[PDB]
Amino acid sequence: STGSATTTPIDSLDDAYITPVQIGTPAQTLNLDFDTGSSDLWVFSSETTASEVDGQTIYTPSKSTTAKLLSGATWSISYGDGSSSSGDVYTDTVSVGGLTVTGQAVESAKKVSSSFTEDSTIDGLLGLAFSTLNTVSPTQQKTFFDNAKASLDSPVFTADLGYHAPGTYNFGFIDTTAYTGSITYTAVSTKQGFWEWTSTGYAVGSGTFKSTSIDGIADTGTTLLYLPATVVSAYWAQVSGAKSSSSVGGYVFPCSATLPSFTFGVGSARIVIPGDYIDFGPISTGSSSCFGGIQSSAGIGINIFGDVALKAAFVVFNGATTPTLGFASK
């Protein structure tokens, strides 16, 4: 089997991407944030504290003939940005782009933090990291990909995120028309439960490539590119007027600037992030200070190849017995 779904930016900055997901019988379609940095599929629901729902579409398990309470199971998660959610668990039929899993754990939110409430466009998350990170207790649950894997034509999914445009998540096959050149594959460590890999270096604009190992995770659920302070300093030093602002919480730059590209290494291959991808607009409405899309990972504890990086590539998440990551230009 295979699946193919379009993923759409939630706003004009590509702050996140939503993908339609069918849950239950008859189908209830919710727009979920596919997140390769976590491993819980959770949704706004009929159980969510009413004051914490503001415009989201909810899952109502009592209206699904295939929903079953997973007795005794609870979940609770906290994300790197400080947001959180928790609740109880159902199993139900879940389909993504024509690909169907029966008995998928659907984690029903009783509580969500303000960040989620305030984002009307995201109805929940669909985790695509390794199932070892899944927070369901006392019986840990498998991700949608893990459940689908054995049925897939090939044990892979791919992320093809658009810049200011829709893209695609495919399950079970590699669309050879979706990228240019060849796909370069690189080793993955699953030790922390992430799609963790090591980039071979970077360049700033038309500058020389610096060979240096950068360990980080491929994370579709994080907006920006978070890299070591040395790397980030080298980038923003090429932008006149750019500075790190503690009050804003990162690098800002004059909105009148033209940003240089940023290149990262995948083995001997190179992925180029155009400068425009690194512009996240005014820090506040009407400001001439703009927020940068490359930020320091210092104090996160991990480097994160988020959407800024991933959307410059066609990315293969290979879930073979020994997982790997593939990157191609597009």
UniProtKB/Swiss-Prot annotation:
Its EC number is 3.4.23.22. It is an enzyme of class 3 (hydrolase). One of its GO terms (molecular function) is aspartic-type endopeptidase activity. GO terms for biological process: proteolysis. Keywords: Aspartyl protease, Disulfide bond, Hydrolase, Protease, Signal, Zymogen. Residues 17-328 form the Peptidase A1 domain. The active site is at D35, S199. It catalyses: Hydrolysis of proteins with specificity similar to that of pepsin A, prefers hydrophobic residues at P1 and P1', but does not cleave 14-Ala-|-Leu-15 in the B chain of insulin or Z-Glu-Tyr. Clots milk. Disulfide bonds join C255-C290. Belongs to the peptidase A1 family. This is Endothiapepsin. It comes from Cryphonectria parasitica. The chain holds residues 90 to 419 of 419 of the full protein.
